[PDB]
Structures are given as structure tokens and as C-alpha cells.
Amino acid sequence: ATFEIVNRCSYTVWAAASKGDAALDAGGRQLNSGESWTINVEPGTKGGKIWARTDCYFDDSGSGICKTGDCGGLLRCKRFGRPPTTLAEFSLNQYGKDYIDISNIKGFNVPMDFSPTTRGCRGVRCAADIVGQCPAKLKAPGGGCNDACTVFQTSEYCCTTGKCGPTEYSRFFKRLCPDAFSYVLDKPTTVTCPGSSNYRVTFCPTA
């Protein structure tokens, strides 16, 4: 499947793509403002994620750091990124269908649209100014808006027991972005697409 990753932000982002224990495609790349990077994700990829990283520095070997979404200091992510990270999440060719969502469960750094480029389902978007409106206690000094699990490490926020409800913090994410997961047990905003659909992830879609 192809995922065109497009940075519409006015700032550079370093896109990342991983399924947690492996890179997807090259795993990461710099996207200057307006750049598009098209990756190929193997059919059947389960639990893949794409995200933006901000304020990154990499040496010639592709080692360094980002202020948001850093994936073990690598340009080419092999693992998931350090919160806060708005997440485009997908599982492909799962009994004939693809499943996509956006999640704020690991916080929010960059606004995102995640849409199919092929027929048969709708896209999802979280493009509200979550960083600007972020509750004081969730603001990440490094940049972005942390989820409450990250900040407070409670069973309730992290849904450790598989028993948790919405919280003042989750409700903030949900209010700003109704169409993204705000906590682990949120009413799902997952979209079912045809198996083998193709997609575009757009950072800062609202230009």
C-alpha cells in the first residue's frame, strides 16, 4: 500500500513510520514545508503508525534527537516515537479490510489528516490547535500536548486494567478532536476501508 506523507506545515517535520518492532519503508525522512514522501507499507501490516517529529537534529549517520516523537534518536525510525505524537494508525488487510484512525492517546504534536486516496471510505482528521489550547498540566516543555498517561502514569489514564473511563484530560482531546481516540477505551473512531486501500497522511491539513 502506498502512503503519501505530505507536510503542509510551515515548519519542517521528520515523518516517521513504524509498526513498533520494525520500520515501515525507510522508517523516517525529513519533510520540509510542502514536501511529499511516498512510502510503501507491506500488505497485512498490523498496528502501523505514522507520525511527525518536530525540531530534529541528525548527524550524517542519521543519529540525533527530536523534541517530539523521537524514535530512539534515529532518523529512520524502527520503533514508535516518544510522546507527544499525534498518531495515524492503521492495520491493513485484516480479514479483507483496512482499518484506520487517528489517536491522541500518546498526545498531540502536529495536526493531521489521514485519508484514503482510493475509493470506499472516509478520512479522519485531527487539525484543531491542540498545542495552543493544551491544558497547563499537559503542556510538554519539549513541545506539544502530552496525554495524561504520559504525564501522570496512573492506571486510570493509562487504562492499565482495561478498566478506565474518560477523564477531564481525555475530554479536552476529544473536544478539540472528536474524530480521534482520546483515551484507550474511547468510543472507536476507526474507519473501515477496503483491503489494500492507499492513503495520504497530511500534516497541518488546514491550509
> What is the three-state SS of 17-53?
EECCCCEEEEEEEEECCCCEEEEECCCCCCCEEEEEE
Q: Which three cell numbers stand for residue 190?
A: 476507526
- The phi-psi region of residue 141 (left if phi > 0; otherwise alpha if psi is between -120 and 50; otherwise beta) is alpha
How many C-beta atoms lie closer than 10 Å to residue 79's C-beta? 16
> What is the three-state SS of 49-73?
EEEEEEEEEECCCCEEEEEECCCCC
Cis amide leading into 43 (omega within 30): no
Task: Report how far residue 145's alpha carbon sits from residue 107's, in angstroms, rounded to the nearest whole number.
Answer: 6
**CATH no. for 1-207:** 2.60.110.10
Q: How many residues are given for the chain? A: 207
Technique used to solve these coordinates: X-ray
What's the resolution in A? 1.8
What's the burial of 97, exposed, middle or buried (CB within 10 Å: 0-12/13-18/19+)? middle
What's the burial of 4, exposed, middle or buried (CB within 10 Å: 0-12/13-18/19+)? middle
Contact 36, 199 (CB under 8 A): no
DSSP character at residue 137: G
Q: Which three cell numbers stand for residue 133?
A: 489550547
Instruction: Give, in order, the Cα–Cα distances in Å from 133 to each of 52, 129, 130, 145, 169.
Output: 19, 6, 5, 9, 12
